[PDB]
């Protein structure tokens, strides 16, 4: 066939891609981040006590895999928030895609260098970091 078809909006593709997100209500995020911490500690100990041949030789690798999986979801957790904050700062000439991408970069730079430290909802911290990142993007765009 050779019939033509209409194009698709880029934003709608983003919404379809993130529709699978399901926020954890800020409650379970602490254990979510305890999975990352233990994963990194597994990283270190895997290459520190190397000689040990044991059934545990696979459990820590599973903890590292759990840490890799725990981040893949934590990042999904905040895309609604980042898109909202980005949309809050539109109308300055930039396509919403460029701002939301910049906020995505800011988020990934944040949470991966964040600790609960008996801190408050990480959502406030993410909002702050992504807001700073998008503000910097707009400023450098001029």
């Amino acid at each position: 066939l050779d019939a033509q078809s209409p194009a698709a909006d880029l934003v709608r593709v983003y919404l379809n891609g993130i529709g699978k997100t399901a926020l954890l209500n800020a409650a379970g995020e602490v254990e979510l981040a305890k999975r990352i911490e233990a994963g990194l500690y597994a990283e270190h100990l895997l290459e520190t006590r190397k000689r040990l041949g044991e059934n545990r030789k696979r459990d820590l690798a599973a903890v590292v895999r759990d840490g890799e999986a725990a981040r893949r979801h934590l990042l999904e957790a905040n895309l609604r928030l980042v898109v909202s904050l980005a949309k809050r700062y539109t109308g300055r000439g930039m396509p919403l895609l460029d701002l939301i991408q910049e906020g995505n970069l800011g988020l990934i730079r944040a949470m991966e260098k964040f600790d609960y430290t008996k801190g408050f909802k990480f959502s406030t911290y993410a909002t702050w970091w992504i807001r700073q990142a998008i503000t910097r993007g707009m400023a450098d765009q001029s």
């Binding site: 702050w128 807001r131 700073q132 503000t135 400023a139």
Partner: protein, 49 residues
Amino acid sequence: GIVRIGAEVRDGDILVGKVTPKGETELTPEERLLRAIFGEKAREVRDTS
């Protein structure tokens, strides 16, 4: 934030309370406006009463 008049005080007791902000990255021209519009009271504070 001050002790009521006529209240007995013992050694080691608190006499007046205050909060000391925490240190983070700052910019003189942008942080002022940013703090004015958004991000109010979102930084750590120490105790130096």
